[model samples]
Target: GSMNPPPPETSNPNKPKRQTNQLQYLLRVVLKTLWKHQFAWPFQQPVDAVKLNLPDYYKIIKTPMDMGTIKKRLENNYYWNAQECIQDFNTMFTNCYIYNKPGDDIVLMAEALEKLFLQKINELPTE
Candidate 1:
């Protein structure tokens, strides 16, 4: 009888190095919740400067961000930690606030999304 080269239970079982997994799981669920929010539609995809006829958008917001971009990055493991993903979310909200006029629907939506994200992240483990 031949067994597999890698034994699932017998390989270095004492390591408790799973905080990263906890962080990832929490972040993943947070992302999912944000993606499903009613206000999420506006932030779901990258802003279409050409179609939207907002030529100054790119000039005002240099680093554009969206939930879709963040989702892809998370799935691809592009982000090293929660801070990185948090930074991207902040950037996305900030970009919207900057590009849109004050009191605009998009600005309001972004603010709401930002509030929700903060609340979600705060409930997670710091380390």
Candidate 2:
């Protein structure tokens, strides 16, 4: 009789099911709505526009927004310039594993992107 390789061992009796927090679930819904309304243009546009370089705008903002930092800035109503926006957005995206999450769902990603955009817009010093 041929012996087959044993199946991999398991830690817990059952694998943990994927669960989303309330905020994450809400964000997911909002993202779906945005997609339906915009036909995914908002998400696609930035990606297409910044595809020329690996470290382009799309790559930076594609990272997750640091909720803590974002909240602090929003509370202070901090304004920023285009460069600053790019920097902060990129930092959050790359460092926070925002895009590296398990699900490929773009809605939550988009919401985070939108927040970054708003933060950048707010940061711009008024003339």
Candidate 3:
């Protein structure tokens, strides 16, 4: 039998929750950056990825707060806030921009997103 110890603190209803490190938090942060920067179809994509892997335009659309794809994934996976966001975004990014080798576009995308993702992590509470 598995015997995993329970956490020290149970989730409480009255107190404000800290969710800075959650996957969904990071997803929203990245999305906000993309949206703010006017990224309609942010990553210049490969024909294969656009034709096969990604179908939901809402996933990378210019509209702010449009999270249909992420919300769908989260609804289907209970641990969506654990690591799924990272996995999903990374897969899409790699498939769309890197795998096919678009040269400098990949570098530029990585550079922009590096600052965006890092900014969120940097703003996290020290406590």
Local accuracy of candidate 3 as per-residue lDDT tens digits, 66-97: 13343444433433244445554455544445
Q: Enumerate residue pairs that collide in model 2.
A: 63-93, 64-93, 79-123, 80-123, 80-124
For model 2, the local distance difference test gives 0.39
Sorting all predicted structures by TM-score, with the top scorer first, yields 1, 3, 2
lDDT of 2 by residue, 40-88 (tens): 4433222332233334334444343343443333233342323432454
Q: Estimate each model's TM-score.
A: 0.79, 0.26, 0.42
RMSD of 2: 16.0
* Runs of candidate 1 exceeding 4 Å displacement: 1-19
For lDDT, the strongest prediction is 1
lDDT of each: 0.72, 0.39, 0.43
> Over all chains combined, what TM-score does candidate 1 have?
0.79
For model 1, name the residue pairs that clash: none
lDDT of 1 by residue, 1-127 (tens): 2221221121132433232653486457789899999999988777777667777776677678888877766665565567767888888988887788898988988889889888988787655
